[PDB]
Structure formats: C-alpha cells, structure tokens
Amino acid sequence: MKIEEGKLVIWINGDKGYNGLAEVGKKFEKDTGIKVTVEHPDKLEEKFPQVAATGDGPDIIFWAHDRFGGYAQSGLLAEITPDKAFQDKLYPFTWDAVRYNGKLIAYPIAVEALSLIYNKDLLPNPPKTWEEIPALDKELKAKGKSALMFNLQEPYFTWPLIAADGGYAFKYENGKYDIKDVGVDNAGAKAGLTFLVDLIKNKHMNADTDYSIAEAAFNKGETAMTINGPWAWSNIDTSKVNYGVTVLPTFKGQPSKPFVGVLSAGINAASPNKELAKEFLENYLLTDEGLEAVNKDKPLGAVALKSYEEELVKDPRIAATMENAQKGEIMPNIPQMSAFWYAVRTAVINAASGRQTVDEALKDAQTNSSSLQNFTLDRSSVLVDGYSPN
Amino acid sequence: DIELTQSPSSLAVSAGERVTMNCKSSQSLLNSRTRKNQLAWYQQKPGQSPELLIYWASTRQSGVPDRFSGSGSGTDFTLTISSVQAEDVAVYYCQQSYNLLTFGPGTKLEIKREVKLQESGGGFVKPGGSLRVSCAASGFTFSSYAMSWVRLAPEMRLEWVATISSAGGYIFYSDSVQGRFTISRDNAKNSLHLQMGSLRSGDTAMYYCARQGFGNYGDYYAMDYWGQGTTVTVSS
C-alpha cells in the first residue's frame, strides 16, 4: 500500500524498448535528481490492475489504450492534465483513444497495427490475398518451407481476418459503443475464422502455433511470411533475414482490418508522484529525443508525437504500419473489452484446435460478449463492514 | 468479527415432518445499498460437497425444491423444510457475507422411520510443513468470477479460508490462516491455488474450491458451485 514519494517506477511490456526508456529515465535523474526505475513484469496488463486495486504498483503503466477504459472505471487511473499546447504536439485521433467519460486518462505514445512481414529471398512478391496462400504453401512445402506462420493463441493476431468481411466487436453508433450490438457472430466473422480453420485442416498452419514458435520459424528462415507488430522487428533485424513489411492480404476482396492499439502511459491513481510523472511524460519521453531512445532499443512503429512520426513515416516499414492502421479500426476502450478478448480468445483457440466448430465457437463468444449489463472487471464478491472494497 | 449460532445442533425427524432451523448473528446483516440480507444457506449431504440452497436470506437457488424455504430479518434467520424427505439427511449451514465470510456451526438433520471444479494436491505433512492445493475450472468464464477456499474440519466445522476476486486485486484470509496461506489464481490456465505453509495440525481438513455466484440482479454473496474436497492431513 505504499508507492514511495520522490521516485518514479514505470511498468512497460517486455517486447517494447524498456532499456531505451530506462535511459530517458537516467536523463530525467541527472536533470532533477529523481530516480526512475523501469520494470517489465510478465502479464503486466493483468498485474497492474491486480496490484493497483489496493494502491500499490508503478507510477506509470504502459499498454494499448483498450485496457485503459477498464482501469479507469476501476478508479486505478489519474486524470492527466496536459494543457492545449502540449495536446497539439500529438495527432488528435490519439487523444480520442485516451478518453473515458470525456476525460483524458493517459498519454498516447505509439500507434500500433499488425503488418504482413515477409522473407524477400523466399518470396519476392508477397500475396495480395488470403485466398492464394494455401497454394503458395504447397509450392513452398516442396522446398521444405511453409508460407505463413503467426500467433494463434492471442486473438489480436487473428482478428484482422475475422473483421475483414464484417466481423466486429461492439458497434460504434452516434459517438457511442452499443454493447448490445455485438458482431463476433455475423457472417463476415464466420467467413474469416472458417478460412483460418481450413488453413489448419489443410496442413498449412498448426493450431499449435504461438508467438515464439512463429517468431523463430520466421527468423530462422523456415516460413515465408509472418504477421506481427513493429516490436517484433528488432529480433528479425539481428537475425539477418532479408525482410519486408507490407499490407495485410485481402479476404474476399476486402482488406484485413487490424485492431489499432494506441500504446499509452497511464498515471496510477494511488501514486504520490503525479506531477513528476506528468513532467517525465510531457517533457522527456514525448520529445523527439525521448521517443528515439526507446525506438533505438525496440521500434515503436508509428508514434503519436507529430514531429517524430514525420521522420519515422519515411521508413517504408512505418508507412506499411500506417497503411494497415488506416485499414483497420481503433479499438474501443470500454470496460467490456476484457470480456470480449477472453471470449474471442476462446473461440479462436477452440475452433482452430478442433474442439468446437466455427459456428459453435463464435456463438459462445457472442453469448459471452453480449448481455454485459454492468460488467465489473474485478469482482470481489466480498463485503467489508457491509461495503464493497473500492 | 461476526458470530453465528445455529439451533438445534442436531435433530431427528420422521419423514414428512415440517422442520425449522435457526440462525442468529451477533449483528444485523442488512446491505444498506441492496436492502438484501447477507445470509445464505448450504446443504452438505454425507460424502458430498456443500450446495447452495438459499442466498439473500429468502431467495432459493435454481434447482432447489420448493419445500426448502428461507426467511428472516435483522439478526434472526430460519430455514424451513415444509415436510422433510429421505434425501434431506444432511448438515445445514448458514453463512454470513456482511463482513467477510463466516459459516455457522451447522444443524445435523437425521431421518428416522458443464460448470466443473476439480481440486488436486492434498496430502500428509509434518507440523510446520507445506502444501499447495489447486482447483481446475471448466464450463464457465472463470475470468469473471471471484473464487473462495472453504475447508471442512472433523467436528462438522465448515470454515471459510480465503477469497480472491475475479481479477485478483482483492484478496481476503480467515484469521485462522492469515500470513501462513496464500491464495492465487491464473486466469490464463483457468486455475486457482492455495499455498499452505507453517501448517498447524488444526489445519487438517477437506479443502473445497467454490465459485462465488452472481447474476443480473447483483452478486449472490454465496457459493453456487463446489468441487470435491481434496484432503490435507497434518500428522504429528
């Protein structure tokens, strides 16, 4: 229950550039004397609301914005106070992603979307469409290679194919999400997931595939294509596979529609250092030099900060990220997103593993996503002197 | 901090008799917000895990025959079986949920003429030793539910041990185990655990994992599914 005054503790995921961020920390230290400690706890997207509930945890938490509505409703997040002058340094759509009840609850950092990453040597002309991948694998199997391998354990990676033809999470109508209009059941959703399963049935993919299997598969040059975000680039860089980053294949003539995540920095509600956090975030991290220190450790992709994005977008890989970003949809941040992810994660794994048909798997995911009247997030089911905790 | 008495402690009836069981608490259990009384009733038939009968004092759980009936207000609660039957031989427990969780001492009733939860990992230990009990969950969105550990000790003693919230932020232990025990969950592997250290011989019991129920009308503040008890014996 103590966060410790006069110090900044920052949490950020392990695939991001925490050492780069840590050096922004050291710069902050020599300028102000405040010590900055960067940690990358595992599953920090769940570790955070778990420790922050009783007022413990880091001063600053990084994740895609989707989870931040959820944290905010649980009161785990401070309202941030950037003046109009700082707000203009960033693209307006990124601020829209950090809103909850009209209030800004985090600082946007990077704009993330999955792209198609291909081995240029194995495959000089990557597929425009999902449909031509099965035949492209047969060819590649003849030379002891596969066409495509990406993470199937995380619905984030499988969502772009599901939504291509009209699958959607919650319907966005007149400025608001309608949590009774759920589209994980519709024909577009089923068309995508059926296609992914048929890929697995015809021995072109393994239901078995997870992030680190697919990564090593691509970085060892054994598969021609992978699907991943900018974070994955640095491991591909060191491996010296000759790789390109480009548009995701179309499905049924429609673009794949990745869920765009705005990587964001939140300030713990329970933190005694909310001013030191604002200053670090506004004056050190969200500067050209700040974002570059992180970026040189592990690429952020496109960034919310205008001045630096204009430099980064010159890189054909970031151009690709943006193009894919523009063809997708910005994720909701509503508290129910947690329920949804769990739901789709289950549907994707059970349909792909065979334990359920596509129709059964998505019907379940749709049931588990729909009547979420006052979905809670951290349900304690306990009273303390006749009252709930928090 | 809340004490519960149940009268009578045992009871022998012929088939068909109407039966009333008492439960009294050291203090009022009324939820100032929901106006529900934080009292629930459980049935433990011989050789089985307890099951939910009544919650919110007077609401019958789905599946429970309507001869079971809960009533009461203030500090005074009653479970009535209008005309008892052979299948009702069981110990009956009131449980309060107004301030943490406490089970009553129980009423032994005798007659004279896809939601699954599986525990694992019980065993023997010397006093001061260790064990970690687990409970694997299936048939529901485990991520959405608070889970609790309850243990049954040799002298008809049903005890709450710990509860962990659906996302783990809120954890609570019985005095009897505070410090020595640690309740954890893994929402990714659909799993609940109780690390038991510095074991007393009084910690010897069957240990149940139980799901805290809720619905469209609010939290049940009651446990609506139980696993079979894994057994923990601390033998001097």
Residue numbers in the entry:
A (entry chain A): 0 to 389
B (entry chain D): 149 to 384
What does the literature reporting this entry say, word for word?
Mucin 16 (MUC16) overexpression is linked with cancer progression, metastasis, and therapy resistance in high grade serous ovarian cancer and other malignancies. The cleavage of MUC16 forms independent bimodular fragments, the shed tandem repeat sequence which circulates as a protein bearing the ovarian cancer biomarker (CA125) and a proximal membrane-bound component which is critical in MUC16 oncogenic behavior. A humanized, high affinity antibody targeting the proximal ectodomain represents a potential therapeutic agent against MUC16 with lower antigenic potential and restricted human tissue expression. We describe the crystal structures of a single chain h4H11-scFv and describe its interaction with MUC16ecto composed of 26 residues (31thLQNFTLDRSSVLVDGYSPNRNEPLTG6th; numbering from TM) to understand the binding mechanism through the comparison of the apo and the MUC16ecto-bound scFv at 2.36 Å and 2.47 Å resolutions, respectively.
The complexes were crystallized at pH 5.0, which is a physiologically relevant pH inside an endosome or in an hypoxic tumor environment. A complete structure of the complex was built except for two regions; the linker domain composed of Gly-Ser repeats and the C-terminal 7 residues (RNEPLTG) of MUC16ecto sequences, that have no visible electron density probably due to high structural flexibility. It could be stabilized by two inter-hydrogen bonds between V19th (-N) – Y16th (-O) at 2.8 Å distance and V19th (-O) – Y16th (-N) at 3.1 Å distance, respectively. To our knowledge, this structure of MUC16ecto, composed of 19 residues is released as the first human MUC16 structure and the first retained ectodomain for any tethered mucin. In particular, the sidechain of VL S180 was moved ∼ 2.5 Å, forming hydrogen bonds with Y16th and G17th of MUC16 (pink highlight). Y108 (VH) underwent a significant 3.3 Å shift towards MUC16, leading to the disruption of previous hydrogen bonds with VL residues (T182, Q243, and S245). Three water molecules (w1-w3) contribute 5 pairs of hydrogen bonds through bridging D106 and Y108, and S180 with the MUC16 ectodomain.
